Each structure stands twice: as structure tokens, then as C-alpha cells.
Amino acid sequence: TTKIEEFYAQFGKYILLVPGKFTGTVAAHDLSTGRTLAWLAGWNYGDTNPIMHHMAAFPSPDPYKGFEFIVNTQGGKNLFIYGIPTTVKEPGEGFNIYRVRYDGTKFNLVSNIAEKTGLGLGVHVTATPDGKGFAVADGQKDIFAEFDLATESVRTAFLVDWKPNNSDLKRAWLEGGTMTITRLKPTLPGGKYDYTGTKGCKIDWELVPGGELFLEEGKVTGTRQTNVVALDAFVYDPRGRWGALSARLPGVAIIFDRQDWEPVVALVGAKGEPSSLPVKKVASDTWEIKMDKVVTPAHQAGFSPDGKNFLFMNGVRQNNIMVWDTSNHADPTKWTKKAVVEDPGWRGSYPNTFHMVFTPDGRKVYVTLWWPSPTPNGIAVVDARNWKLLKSVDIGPDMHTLAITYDGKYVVGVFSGYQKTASGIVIMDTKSDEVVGILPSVGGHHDCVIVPKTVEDLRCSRCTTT
Amino acid sequence: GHMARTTKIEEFYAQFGKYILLVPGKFTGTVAAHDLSTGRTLAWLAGWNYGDTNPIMHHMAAFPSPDPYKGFEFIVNTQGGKNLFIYGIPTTVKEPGEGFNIYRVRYDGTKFNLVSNIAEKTGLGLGVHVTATPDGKGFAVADGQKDIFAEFDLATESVRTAFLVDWKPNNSDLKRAWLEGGTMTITRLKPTLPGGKYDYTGTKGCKIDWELVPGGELFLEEGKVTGTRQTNVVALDAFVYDPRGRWGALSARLPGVAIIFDRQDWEPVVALVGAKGEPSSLPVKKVASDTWEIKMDKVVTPAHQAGFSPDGKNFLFMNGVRQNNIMVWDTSNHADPTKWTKKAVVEDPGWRGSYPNTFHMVFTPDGRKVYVTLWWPSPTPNGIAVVDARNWKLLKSVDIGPDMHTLAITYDGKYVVGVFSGYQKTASGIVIMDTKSDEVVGILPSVGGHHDCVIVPKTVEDLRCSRCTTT
Numbered sequence: 046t047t048k049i050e051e052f053y054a055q056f057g058k059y060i061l062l063v064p065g066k067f068t069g070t071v072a073a074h075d076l077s078t079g080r081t082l083a084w085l086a087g088w089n090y091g092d093t094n095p096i097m098h099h100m101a102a103f104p105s106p107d108p109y110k111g112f113e114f115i116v117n118t119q120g121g122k123n124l125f126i127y128g129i130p131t132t133v134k135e136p137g138e139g140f141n142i143y144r145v146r147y148d149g150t151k152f153n154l155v156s157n158i159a160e161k162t163g164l165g166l167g168v169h170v171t172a173t174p175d176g177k178g179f180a181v182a183d184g185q186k187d188i189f190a191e192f193d194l195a196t197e198s199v200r201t202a203f204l205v206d207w208k209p210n211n212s213d214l215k216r217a218w219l220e221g222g223t224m225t226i227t228r229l230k231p232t233l234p235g236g237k238y239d240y241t242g243t244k245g246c247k248i249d250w251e252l253v254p255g256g257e258l259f260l261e262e263g264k265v266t267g268t269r270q271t272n273v274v275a276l277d278a279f280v281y282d283p284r285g286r287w288g289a290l291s292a293r294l295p296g297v298a299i300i301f302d303r304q305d306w307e308p309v310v311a312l313v314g315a316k317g318e319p320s321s322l323p324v325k326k327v328a329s330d331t332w333e334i335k336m337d338k339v340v341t342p343a344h345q346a347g348f349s350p351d352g353k354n355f356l357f358m359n360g361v362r363q364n365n366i367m368v369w370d371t372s373n374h375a376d377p378t379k380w381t382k383k384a385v386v387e388d389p390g391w392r393g394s395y396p397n398t399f400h401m402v403f404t405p406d407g408r409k410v411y412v413t414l415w416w417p418s419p420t421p422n423g424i425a426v427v428d429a430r431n432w433k434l435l436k437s438v439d440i441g442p443d444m445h446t447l448a449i450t451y452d453g454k455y456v457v458g459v460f461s462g463y464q465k466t467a468s469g470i471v472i473m474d475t476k477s478d479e480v481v482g483i484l485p486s487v488g489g490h491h492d493c494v495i496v497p498k499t500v501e502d503l504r505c506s507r508c509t510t511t
Numbered sequence: 512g513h514m515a516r517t518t519k520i521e522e523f524y525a526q527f528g529k530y531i532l533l534v535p536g537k538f539t540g541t542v543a544a545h546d547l548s549t550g551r552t553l554a555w556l557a558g559w560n561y562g563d564t565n566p567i568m569h570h571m572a573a574f575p576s577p578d579p580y581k582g583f584e585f586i587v588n589t590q591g592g593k594n595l596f597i598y599g600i601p602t603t604v605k606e607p608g609e610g611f612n613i614y615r616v617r618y619d620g621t622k623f624n625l626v627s628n629i630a631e632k633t634g635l636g637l638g639v640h641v642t643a644t645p646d647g648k649g650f651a652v653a654d655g656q657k658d659i660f661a662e663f664d665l666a667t668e669s670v671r672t673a674f675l676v677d678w679k680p681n682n683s684d685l686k687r688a689w690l691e692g693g694t695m696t697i698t699r700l701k702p703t704l705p706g707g708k709y710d711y712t713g714t715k716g717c718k719i720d721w722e723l724v725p726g727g728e729l730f731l732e733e734g735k736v737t738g739t740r741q742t743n744v745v746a747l748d749a750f751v752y753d754p755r756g757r758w759g760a761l762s763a764r765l766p767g768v769a770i771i772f773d774r775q776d777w778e779p780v781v782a783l784v785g786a787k788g789e790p791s792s793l794p795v796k797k798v799a800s801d802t803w804e805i806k807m808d809k810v811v812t813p814a815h816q817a818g819f820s821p822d823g824k825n826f827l828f829m830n831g832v833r834q835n836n837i838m839v840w841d842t843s844n845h846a847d848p849t850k851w852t853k854k855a856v857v858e859d860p861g862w863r864g865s866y867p868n869t870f871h872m873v874f875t876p877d878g879r880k881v882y883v884t885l886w887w888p889s890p891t892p893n894g895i896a897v898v899d900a901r902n903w904k905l906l907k908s909v910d911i912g913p914d915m916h917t918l919a920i921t922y923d924g925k926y927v928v929g930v931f932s933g934y935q936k937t938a939s940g941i942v943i944m945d946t947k948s949d950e951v952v953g954i955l956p957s958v959g960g961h962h963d964c965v966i967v968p969k970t971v972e973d974l975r976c977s978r979c980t981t982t
């Protein structure tokens with residue numbers, strides 16, 4: 046009695062790319078036909094702990110004929126944080142960064158940029174606005190780098206360290222401290238860094254949502270637990286020049302000048318705190334930020350497509366969407382707080398607002414509402430002119446990332462079952478803000494992207510927000 | 512006017528009723544259950560998370576559950592060793608994991624739980640077809656590198672019987688080792704290790720270093736498959752069950768024979784010979800208390816997929832490559848399989864080349880139609896043949912996509928659900944066909960290399976058209 050053709054025909058020709066987290070795979074699906082075009086399983090290549098984590102794809106003149114993307118993995122004890130009763134004793138080290146190319150037929154594993162450069166980074170991957178480079182951060186090592194895609198080389202890498210005012214773990218961020226940013230230099234032959242695999246870790250796994258409390262309460266193992274800032278992502282100003290490096294635990298977004306590779310200002314997420322803190326150069330490769338206190342952690346961070354707003358989602362101790370007027374492209378030290386999105390139903394850690402996507406016209410922003418089991422996770426729909434919550438919709442357990450078709454007609458999200466229960470791809474019509482359907486997905490995905498065609502598409506892909 | 516309005520998927524899924532589709536992923540290393548009523552994947556498990564470093568998740572069968580949404584159980588097995596190297600994935604792994612695990616998995620209404628590894632306990636590492644017994648209380652696994660099969664008790668996870676099958680070729684030259692006939696020996700095995708354990712863990716016992724891939728039976732003849740006992744292979748595939756009980760048929764790809772076993776005294780009783788123009792059957796000769804022989808003057812063609820119809824009165828065996836057809840026997844004589852005779856053969860002019868191979872199947876519960884996949888190597892689209900299972904006449908053939916494997920059917924008979932698998936590298940999907948109109952109603956995405964799929968049954972009557980009666 047009913048065929049699926051009319052459901053798929055509504056979407057136009059877009060390709061959804063997903064990593065699978067504990068499944069270990071990456072896959073591209075054709076939204077016009079329902080077919081999985083291609084997939085790749087990391088363990089087939091001898092990666093024994095292929096926790097396929099974050100990714101971003103580059104503009105392709107015709108994604109159907111071919112496209113390329115970066116996907117990274119985590120490793121070590123990250124295998125142990127989702128309650129899977131595995132007896133594995135010595136997990137694969139992980140922290141790979143894979144370049145993958147779809148050739149119209151299959152995926153090709155082109156290179157391991159982590160092996161090539163020495164930097165093993167496991168958290169967010171983002172494409173630069175020109176589609177010619179990409180960044181990866183890691184929140185266990187607190188390093189990030191920007192890479193040149195053509196030469197697979199490091200343009201810059203930085204370490205970020207916390208020196209707490211109070212050495213007591215419970216009080217290590219609340220009572221403030223000094224954040225030190227160091228521009229790194231390779232230490233090994235051939236210009237290679239020494240951070241492959243688990244090397245450089247301050248803590249033995251990435252913090253989960255609300256994890257900051259777990260860290261403070263001594264539930265996370267590691268050799269440098271009070272020196273962690275939990276770098277998350279380096280998201281890009283669509284107008285060029287600037288990138289914002291999110292630091293979860295101090296709740297700061299450090300803005301970098303990508304032309305001379307120095308930090309220029311620190312935005313402070315918490316409501317009631319100043320717009321920003323100055324960055325002080327104290328040696329030729331070293332800068333500091335002094336914080337008397339840290340009111341709350343923050344996590345999701347991103348620019349609107351026009352680059353004139355920057356968002357940072359405060360979580361745990363405060364719970365809201367902080368908005369800065371970044372319309373002055375010349376000078377980020379003048380970026381200032383302009384609005385905060387709040388709701389009576391949003392307090393403390395959950396929901397955690399931890400991924401977003403804007404409409405291409407910048408009218409609305411869709412934001413994930415994450416909770417631990419068993420509260421239903423969903424999508425919040427925010428008016429992004431007036432900065433007000435419009436609507437919330439329940440989807441399924443453990444909601445992760447949101448992408449948008451480049452015509453702005455459909456949001457496409459993924460939920461991931463905490464790596465063990467229900468999972469799926471969800472598609473929401475941006476006119477009605479109603480779910481039109483869910484497709485099956487064998488994935489624990491913490492990411493998803495729609496393969497972009499132009500640099501303009503990146504403005505609402507994995508470049509400007511995570 | 513092509514984009515006049517939004518469409519919701521609800522009506523599409525509502526038509527299927529409450530059925531749960533399970534799939535293994537071959538090179539993806541996963542198993543997953545999908546709720547056809549909502550589109551949601553209820554749960555999945557990735558073998559590598561548990562320390563299985565070569566989880567080639569190959570075949571599975573599920574047991575009847577009074578409410579699959581609240582819980583069910585299934586068996587899925589794996590291959591291992593150099594099987595990782597045979598689908599053109601350019602991995603540089605040097606020493607792949609041993610594999611050949613047989614995992615018992617239970618869905619608890621929320622997640623899958625790995626309950627046990629039957630292969631570790633019994634010492635039988637077997638990596639080809641898994642089939643549920645008709646009572647839903649046991650299962651069989653066969654392996655086509657080691658040429659062994661066993662039936663297991665589910666409750667005790669113990670081995671009820673295991674047999675080796677070996678080939679002694681009349682002509683010792685690989686190229687003619689089957690064509691010119693030979694003797695097949697069937698041996699009832701006895702465990703050799705303490706704890707009543709067999710000595711066939713991992714790759715141990717393999718005659719060839721990797722499986723004969725779909726369509727690839729004759730690669731061994733051509734010198735393309737390495738191994739220590741190359742010309743002694745029969746490539747056992749499946750033990751499929753008579754739904755009337757007592758009998759099971761053991762398929763042996765390279766001799767193109769199905770050996771009928773009596774499950775009540777564990778002895779083979781007759782060998783059905785697949786090839787068109789050859790006799791319906793050959794006798795089995797007992798030559799020692801634990802040993803039987805079948806003698807063949809020639810082997811005309813290999814064969815692969817096999818099954819009984821739901822009523823048990825027809826048995827099908829698919830000849831492939833040197834002939835592509837569906838061979839059908841009249842099995843209506845439940846008392847004596849030595850009287851089972853060929854009664855029809857489905858052929859088609861479009862099937863005269865090397866490919867397509869008539870491949871996996873599923874019958875309608877009422878027995879009136881059987882659906883049979885049509886396999887080809889890249890790049891020809893694979894499809895589904897709709898066969899009239901009363902007159903034994905091809906009715907229709909529909910193109911689906913690359914590397915089509917198994918078919919399942921909702922148990923009210925209304926939809927066939929199949930999987931295609933991209934040769935572990937290109938397009939993959941779940942395909943759903945309406946059995947009233949025999950049209951494809953849609954494809955859903957699938958991250959899978961699946962060579963199997965089942966819909967979780969509620970009763971032993973449902974097993975008559977699940978992974979029990981046919982592959």
C-alpha cells in the first residue's frame with residue numbers, strides 16, 4: 046500500500062555522513078534514495094579501538110561523484126565509559142585522524158594525519174571556511190591544531206593548561222586560576238610532534254555532559270586532573286580571520302587570530318560575568334588569562350552564518366545560551382554580550398545544549414537538548430533574531446548533532462542510544478518544526494554532516510558550530 | 512509541482528505491522544535490530560568492543576519470543592583469519608584475529624546482552640550458516656572451510672552432534688578434483704579435549720585459508736584459494752530443517768549435494784544430487800560405526816542455497832555457475848527420504864551465463880510463492896526473482912542493487928524484507944517488497960555487509976519461513 050519515494054523526494058539531493066562511535070564505522074547515506082552509498086569499518090584496517098568520533102567534510106562540486114572528509118577516533122579508556130560490560134584489559138590507543146575520500150563507488154582511506162604529523166587529537170574536527178584546512182581539538186590532552194589539507198601539515202598547534210588557585214580538586218575551577226596558552230613546536234625528526242596515541246593525556250577519558258562535576262568529585266582518573274581545561278572545539282568565524290577555541294571547564298572561548306597565530310581575547314560564558322578577559326603575552330610563545338573564579342562550565346560554541354553573533358552554551362552551574370555581538374569583524378576585543386536564552390525548564394546540567402545548527406538565512410538556530418537516561422532527549426528551536434526559545438520537541442535517547450540541508454528546508458539529527466539502546470536519524474521540516482521521520486541507524490554517532498557543495502554551505506556545516 | 516508539500520514517513524512504516532528486523536554486518540563487525548513500525552534501531556552491538564579483533568559477523572537465527580519488543584534471543588557467528596582479506600578492502604593487517612565465534616545474544620527490551628560464546632565452551636569454531644531447529648530449542652551451525660557441522664542444545668549450550676565431511680577426488684589435479692567425481696566420507700566426531708570439548712577453536716581445522724565467497728565456488732579449482740587440504744574440500748554451507756521434524760538437510764557446495772540426516776538417531780540417510788540431468792539422489796553407505804560414504808562418478812555443477820517449503824513437501828537446492836537454476840524435490844513422503852525425487856526445475860534463458868546465481872530464498876507462509884535473490888558480481892544490479900511455488904515457473908524479476916543477499920518475510924505474509932551489501936565497500940540497504948503486488952515499496956539505509964537477516968519470530972509456526980527451513 047505505501048511507497049517511500051514521496052518521503053525521500055521531498056529532500057532533494059543531499060548526502061548524510063555519520064561516524065558510529067562504538068560501532069567503529071563511517072557511512073554516507075543518500076537522502077534521495079534511502080541507500081547507504083558507502084561505509085568503512087576502522088577495525089578492518091587494524092585500528093583495534095576505532096571509536097569514530099567527530100568529522101567534517103569539504104566542499105565538493107558534485108558530492109555524488111566524490112567528496113572528502115576528516116574523521117577522528119578516541120582510544121584507551123574511552124572504551125569504558127558507556128557501561129558496555131567488556132573484559133578488554135588493554136584497549137587500542139586510538140587518537141587517529143583519518144582522511145577519507147568517496148570516489149563515487151566506495152570510501153578510500155587516504156591517510157592517517159595523526160601518524161603523519163604526530164598529533165593524536167580525539168575531540169571536535171572542523172573544516173576552515175575556505176574548505177582548504179581543518180582543526181582538531183582534544184579535551185584530555187588540551188591541545189588543538191589547524192592543518193593544511195593539501196599538504197597534510199600542521200599550520201599551528203597549542204597546549205592550554207590550568208593552574209588552579211585552590212589545589213583542592215573540588216575547588217580547582219570554582220576558585221579560579223591561570224590559564225596558560227603555549228604555541229607548540231615539534232620535538233621529533235621531520236617536524237613531527239610527540240603526541241600520538243595516549244601520549245599527553247591529563248585525564249584518562251573525555252568528560253561526559255555535566256562531567257565537570259565528576260572531575261571535581263574525583264570520579265575521573267588521570268595524572269593531571271587539576272590542570273585540565275577540557276578543550277572542545279576550534280570553531281570558525283565564517284568571515285575569516287578568527288577562530289574560537291572552547292575550553293569546557295573554565296567556561297571560556299579563546300579567540301585566535303589565524304593570520305599571526307596568537308590568542309587575542311577570552312570570551313567568558315557565564316551570565317553576570319564580563320563579556321571577555323584580556324590575554325597577556327608573557328613569553329614569545331606563551332600567553333595567560335587570569336580568572337578570579339569560574340562561575341560555570343560551558344560547552345557548545347559557534348557563529349551564526351553571517352558571523353555577527355557568537356553563541357556559547359553555559360551548562361551545569363548555569364544553563365543557558367550566551368550570545369555576543371561579534372559584528373565588528375576588525376577587532377574581537379570589542380565583542381560583547383548582547384542576549385541570553387533562558388527557560389524555566391533549563392537548570393543545572395540537564396538538559397545540556399551541546400550541539401546546534403543555524404538556518405542558512407540565520408533566522409533560527411536548532412539546539413540539541415541532551416539528558417542522561419531515561420529522560421527523552423530532543424531539539425529546541427530558537428529564534429535567532431530575538432534570542433527567544435520557540436519550541437522543544439522530544440526525539441529519542443541520547444540526542445547528538447544537527448545538520449541542515451543547504452536549502453534550509455530540513456534539519457537532520459542523530460541519536461545514539463548511549464551506545465547500547467535506540468539509535469536513529471531524525472529529519473525535521475524547518476517550516477513546521479515537526480519531525481517528518483526517523484530512519485534506522487546502526488550508529489552511536491556524536492557527529493553528522495551533510496556533504497557541502499560550496500564554501501557558503503560550510504557556514505551551516507561543521508565549521509562554524511559543532 | 513514536484514515539491515508541493517512535506518511528507519511524513521508514518522504511513523510507510525504503519526503498513527508493515529509490529530515486526531523487528533535483525534541483521535549482522537559482515538565487515539562492519541556489528542549486529543542490530545530495527546523496529547519496522549517506527550524506523551528506529553532498537554539496539555546494536557559491535558563485536559570489537561568486547562575484544563573480538565576480527566568480528567566478521569556472518570550468519571544468525573532468532574528463537575520464538577512471545578513478545579519480541581520485550582525480549583528475544585538469537586545466535587550470530589563470525590568468521591576469522593584470512594577471511595578479512597577477501598573482499599578487496601586494502602587493509603595492511605598482517606595477523607588477523609582468529610575469529611570463528613558463536614555468540615548468544617539476548618535483547619532485553621532496551622539493549623543487547625552478550626550472554627555467551629558457544630564456540631569457546633564447546634571448542635567448535637564454525638563460521639557459516641546458523642539455523643534454528645523447528646521447535647526453537649536448538650540450532651545448527653556449519654562451516655565451509657573446515658567442512659564440519661553441529662547441532663546444539665540452546666538450554667545447555669551443549670553439542671548434540673558434530674560431523675566432518677571430507678572429499679577424496681578421483682582426479683588429484685585441482686582443476687578436475689570435483690568434475691571427475693570422488694567419494695564423500697561423513698564422520699560422526701567425538702570431542703577430544705577435557706570438558707567434552709572439541710578441538711576446532713579459531714582457524715583450527717581449516718582445509719582452505721578463507722571461505723569460498725558468494726559466486727566463487729569454482730575459485731578453488733582455479734588455484735585462487737590457498738589451503739593445506741584444497742582438493743578435500745566440500746564447502747559445507749547449511750543444515751536446513753524439515754519443518755515437519757526428524758530430518759535436516761546438509762548442503763555441500765562443491766559436490767552439489769544435500770545430505771539428509773535423521774536427527775533422531777544422528778545418521779545420514781540419503782544424498783540428494785542438485786544438478787539438472789543427474790539422478791534425484793545417491794545412496795549413503797555405512798562403512799564403520801561412525802562413518803558413511805557417498806560415491807560420485809562426476810560433479811556437474813556446484814550448488815549453494817537450500818530450503819524446505821513451509822509445509823515440508825518441497826525441497827529446493829540452487830545449482831550455480833555451471834548451471835543456474837532452482838532444483839525442486841517432492842519431499843511429501845515424511846517417512847522415508849530415500850523416496851524423495853526431483854519434481855521440477857526452474858530455469859530462465861536470462862540465467863544461461865555464469866551469473867546470475869539463484870541465491871537465498873523465502874517462501875510465503877501459505878507456500879504459494881517463493882522469492883529468490885539473483886546474485887551477480889560487480890557491476891551488474893542484483894535482484895529478486897518471484898517464483899510460483901505451485902507450478903514452479905518464474906513470475907517476475909526485479910532489479911534492487913549491488914550484492915543482494917538474504918530475504919525474510921513478515922509472518923502475516925505481507926512483506927518480504929531483504930538486504931544488499933555493496934561487496935563490503937559500495938551501496939548497501941534494506942529493501943522491502945509488497946507480496947500482493949510484488950513491487951518494491953522502499954529502501955532504508957543500512958550500515959552493513961549483511962549476508963543474513965531475520966525477522967524475530969513469535970512462534971514455531973513462524974520459523975517455517977525464517978532461518979530454520981531455508982538459507
Ligand SMILES: N#C[Se-]
Pocket residue numbers: 640725748916962982
Ligand atoms: N550463504 C551465504 Se552468503
Ligand SMILES: [Cu+2]
Pocket residue numbers: 169277278344345399511
Ligand atoms: Cu563538544
Ligand SMILES: [Cu+2]
Pocket residue numbers: 399400444445446491492
Ligand atoms: Cu554529541
Ligand SMILES: [Cu+2]
Pocket residue numbers: 098491
Ligand atoms: Cu562525543
Ligand SMILES: [Cu+2]
Pocket residue numbers: 512513514515
Ligand atoms: Cu515542482
Ligand SMILES: [Cu+2]
Pocket residue numbers: 640748749815816982
Ligand atoms: Cu550459504
Ligand SMILES: [Cu+2]
Pocket residue numbers: 725871915916917962963
Ligand atoms: Cu548471502
Ligand SMILES: [Cu+2]
Pocket residue numbers: 569962
Ligand atoms: Cu556469506
Ligand code: NA
Pocket residue numbers: 138242243
Ligand atoms: Na603507547
Ligand SMILES: [Se]
Pocket residue numbers: 445491
Ligand atoms: Se559529543
